[PDB]
Amino acid sequence: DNDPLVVNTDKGRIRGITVDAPSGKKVDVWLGIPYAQPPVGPLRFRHPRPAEKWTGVLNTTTPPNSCVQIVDTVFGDFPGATMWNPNTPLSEDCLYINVVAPRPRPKNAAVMLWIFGGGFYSGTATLDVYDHRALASEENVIVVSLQYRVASLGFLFLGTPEAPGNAGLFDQNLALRWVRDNIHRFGGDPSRVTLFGESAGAVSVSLHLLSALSRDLFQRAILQSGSPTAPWALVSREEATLRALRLAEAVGCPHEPSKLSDAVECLRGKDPHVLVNNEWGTLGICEFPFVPVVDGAFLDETPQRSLASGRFKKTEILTGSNTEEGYYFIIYYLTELLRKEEGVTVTREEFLQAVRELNPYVNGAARQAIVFEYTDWTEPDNPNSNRDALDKMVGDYHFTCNVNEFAQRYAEEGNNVYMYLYTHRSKGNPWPRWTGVMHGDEINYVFGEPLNPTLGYTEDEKDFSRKIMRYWSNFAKTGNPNPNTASSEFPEWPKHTAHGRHYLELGLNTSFVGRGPRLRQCAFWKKYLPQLVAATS
Amino acid sequence: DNDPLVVNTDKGRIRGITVDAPSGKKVDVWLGIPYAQPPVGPLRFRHPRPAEKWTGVLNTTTPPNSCVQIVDTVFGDFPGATMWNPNTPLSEDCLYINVVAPRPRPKNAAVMLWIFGGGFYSGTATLDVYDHRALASEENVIVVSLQYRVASLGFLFLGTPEAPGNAGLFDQNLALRWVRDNIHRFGGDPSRVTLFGESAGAVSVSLHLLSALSRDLFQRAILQSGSPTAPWALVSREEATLRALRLAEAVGCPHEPSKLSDAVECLRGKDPHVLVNNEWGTLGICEFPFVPVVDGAFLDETPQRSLASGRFKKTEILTGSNTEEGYYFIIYYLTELLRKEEGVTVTREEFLQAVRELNPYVNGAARQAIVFEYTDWTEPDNPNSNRDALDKMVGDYHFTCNVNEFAQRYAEEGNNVYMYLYTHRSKGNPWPRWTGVMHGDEINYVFGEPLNPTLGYTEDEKDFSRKIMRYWSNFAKTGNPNPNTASSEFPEWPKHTAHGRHYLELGLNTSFVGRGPRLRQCAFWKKYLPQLVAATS
Numbered sequence A, B: 001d002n003d004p005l006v007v008n009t010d011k012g013r014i015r016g017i018t019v020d021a022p023s024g025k026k027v028d029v030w031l032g033i034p035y036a037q038p039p040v041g042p043l044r045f046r047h048p049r050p051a052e053k054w055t056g057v058l059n060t061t062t063p064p065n066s067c068v069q070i071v072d073t074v075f076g077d078f079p080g081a082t083m084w085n086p087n088t089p090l091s092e093d094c095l096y097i098n099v100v101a102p103r104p105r106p107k108n109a110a111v112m113l114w115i116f117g118g119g120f121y122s123g124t125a126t127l128d129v130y131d132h133r134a135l136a137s138e139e140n141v142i143v144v145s146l147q148y149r150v151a152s153l154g155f156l157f158l159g160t161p162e163a164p165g166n167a168g169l170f171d172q173n174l175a176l177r178w179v180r181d182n183i184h185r186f187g188g189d190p191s192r193v194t195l196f197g198e199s200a201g202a203v204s205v206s207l208h209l210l211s212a213l214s215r216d217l218f219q220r221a222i223l224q225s226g227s228p229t230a231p232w233a234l235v236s237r238e239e240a241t242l243r244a245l246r247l248a249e250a251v252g253c254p255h256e257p258s259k260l261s262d263a264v265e266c267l268r269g270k271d272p273h274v275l276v277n278n279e280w281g282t283l284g285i286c287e288f289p290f291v292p293v294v295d296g297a298f299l300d301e302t303p304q305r306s307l308a309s310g311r312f313k314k315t316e317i318l319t320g321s322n323t324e325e326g327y328y329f330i331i332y333y334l335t336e337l338l339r340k341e342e343g344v345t346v347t348r349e350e351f352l353q354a355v356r357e358l359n360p361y362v363n364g365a366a367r368q369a370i371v372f373e374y375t376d377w378t379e380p381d382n383p384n385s386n387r388d389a390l391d392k393m394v395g396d397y398h399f400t401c402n403v404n405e406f407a408q409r410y411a412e413e414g415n416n417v418y419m420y421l422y423t424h425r426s427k428g429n430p431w432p433r434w435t436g437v438m439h440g441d442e443i444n445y446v447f448g449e450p451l452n453p454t455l456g457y458t459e460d461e462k463d464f465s466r467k468i469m470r471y472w473s474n475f476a477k478t479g480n481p482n483p484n485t486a487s488s489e490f491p492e493w494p495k496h497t498a499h500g501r502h503y504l505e506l507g508l509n510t511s512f513v514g515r516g517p518r519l520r521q522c523a524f525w526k527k528y529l530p531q532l533v534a535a536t537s
């Protein structure tokens, strides 16, 4: 074949299609390249098998199925809630990759691989927000995305080999090995693969930096609002087995800890949709029913012990938090208070009740430590203050501080870190104004969604998008986000060093460099509060 | 008589002298007017008696004796230390008043009454720092100062009428009633007397605001770096009696808690100096052996309870702190760490040990609550941060926070309050640069010492002194430190309201208005830590 759009992968030939980006610039896309045997029937819960080789030319030309998950119907057809909802048909047969190359096609260029996040229970590579075409065209990078199994279908653990856990991670791993073996034919460099993800995607990206198996499969990592040391990232395998048996019971299957073989077999028989819909029960804020576990294969120790011993890939890291990480999660959980409407406020009575519900595992001397740390003492009863106080305590404990820890441990092991604090509200944000810059607002801007002429992004926001797209891209290219010739419209990004802890604020009219961010609160959660609960128990 | 320099005081007549001020302007001074029968012999430890009438005229021209006290000598003949050492012969006969009037003599001027503060163990009205001549001439106000018995000689408590306690406070009280009777003859209005003091002197004027016997003796109050709720201000009756018997035991007297009249009789025999030198046993930082006690007459309840119930004089108060209150007392206490050297620093290990030596009563969980609250979490190990940390944790608990509490409590009850933060370090400072603006640095500017050209104060400092002398003065006059016109040279000083809690920063180039000061830390000491120590035993 002399036809550029056909590519001969290790398992067969595939045909892509030439499409315009929203920006107008033309790119070459390959949608739904199968990288694994569909994990159906006997293969459910288990690790993926490589794809069977196919005879002829396969048209990899249609956005692939998204994996079986719940749909967010709590706010109805609210555009802020539905943008995260899967936009393709749901199927167990969902293990597919997407490749987008720029035109003119490069001979050998950087590869930016996007692992999506949804708290390991939801998400798809096919979301309209993850605009591959805009990033690939504007930065000259091969943009790659993968679909991995999610929820119980991707992370069920029972201790047995028929449910060994981390299926979704081995899905990602296998997909990385595919990129290694094939990305050169699309014009990428199998040695310059940069993994980048948000939330559970960032947790995944970080787990690949830790993992023994996916170690030599990529070069660099960008981690948006996530780290492997986060509370929700992993569960004890003692708990994971219980969550699984409680799900077995909930769907009407044998749930005896002795006959675990009876459990998996029955579970393999049930409909995937009823399976993913009965996972939720008594769960606190920011804790998800089925997530990664320390299995022995992908991870043989907790991320804590991995970070401590310094056992992680020696590479550059770009990482950062948003200003209001918590709000999003405090809206869904704790729904009666803090509802979806403008100008909502929290009383001192309600704040005191919330810290009890948002931290239901601390003895009470610790709750007082929290109420003191997360209260504005210049005006202790202020209704706005007591609301924003809730966002910070959730945002710090579950997100911002875990990101900080990871970045710091990489920094003192002698690796170049680049820390950001994303502080920009989109002018047409559908959410109430009090939410501010929430969890995963940067995603639109990193994917060049403002450049879409059919959308109402301002001229300033279009610059800001191109700005952070460059930062991200040439980090994936060079290992450093700064321009080679040191520009002024592109401010400097100091290295997040162990002793200095410097971060760059990402907003419209700023080049501000701070330290942390939020150092006092992180020391509260990491240093002070643990030794208090020890002293009071 | 027709000589202006002689005045017919109710108990006799006195002759003063006209003398120049450092400003060049002249004033009339009366120095060492006896307001009480000398508290010698059987009258030691007891409340003062009014002085006997004298025939003829009395030369009140030379500065009076200072009360028997310990002499600071740990830094030898060092300018920083010696300025607080007594500058007149030490005598048990020391109860005298000083009156300084401007020229030309006013008819019914405002009266500013200065109560000195040497931590209730030291001090004298005669100190060159307190020189009244400048304040009187420059602000056109008659300035008064009193001597009160200090240390055990003025504050020995046993519970018996022989040693009832608060002799020094009754010394102060009798001086107030003297002012009311006689101040009109000097050109003062006995209805508009405002008390102002610093440290122990400030907690003295605060106790007059609380006392039943003092409430109709003055009009307003200025309280520099002191409040009646300060931990060092009062001691329990149990302690005060045990402190007394230990003084009896150390000096070689009967010390049995059965027969107390044997102890006091013996103590009346011993030398005044041998008595004040042996009172210093094992006392923590900012702990003074002989201080005011809730006796029954001068105070019949703790200032804590008196503040809670709102039982204090309805009147305007002007109060505030310095930035480095703690350093002074640490310098003397922790003598081996942070000595009187230039550029001294504290290691993290030395800081962790210091918090135990500075808070020797908290359990251990509370020690850790302190170390967390007083760590610069930007650079947790920084030698400068860890040294400055010691100043703050001492200065807050013992000074700043208690001043805040009193000011707010007065404001809450509907009284007009004016809070200051004194941040100006004098250029010609004898102490090392790291000490900053220490306890009692404001005194020099309050009394107009920069207006003495022989002391070489800078031109901006000369204006700064006139600025704060005015604030103080027209507060004593009007009840508000602001002038009528409000020009740029005299910035606005907003009221310290219950919810606002505004303070004016008193520095050279500044005009800044803040909240507090140091709200989070006062909330730490008044709210969090007390409830933490209770939860942990």
Ligand SMILES: *[C@@H]1O[C@H](CO)[C@@H](O)[C@H](O[C@@H]2O[C@H](CO)[C@@H](O)[C@H](O)[C@H]2NC(C)=O)[C@H]1NC(C)=O
Pocket: A059
């Ligand atoms: C897409 O893949 C299908 C088979 O799944 C393949 O048939 C298409 O090629 C086209 O096949 C048509 C036969 O029904 C034929 O009419 C058409 O000419 C042919 N196109 C070409 C270029 O040979 C695949 N699409 C494309 C664009 O080839």
Ligand SMILES: *[C@@H]1O[C@H](CO)[C@@H](O)[C@H](O[C@@H]2O[C@H](CO)[C@@H](O)[C@H](O)[C@H]2NC(C)=O)[C@H]1NC(C)=O
Pocket: B058, B059
């Ligand atoms: C001050 O009080 C003394 C008390 O003895 C008094 O003596 C002074 O008056 C002066 O007294 C002197 C007696 O030695 C006498 O020589 C002198 O004339 C007299 N001074 C006069 C009248 O001006 C008192 N002060 C003053 C200045 O008299």
Ligand SMILES: [N+]
Pocket: A084, A117, A118, A199, A440
């Ligand atoms: N999300």
Ligand SMILES: [N+]
Pocket: B084, B117, B118, B199, B439, B440
């Ligand atoms: N002092």
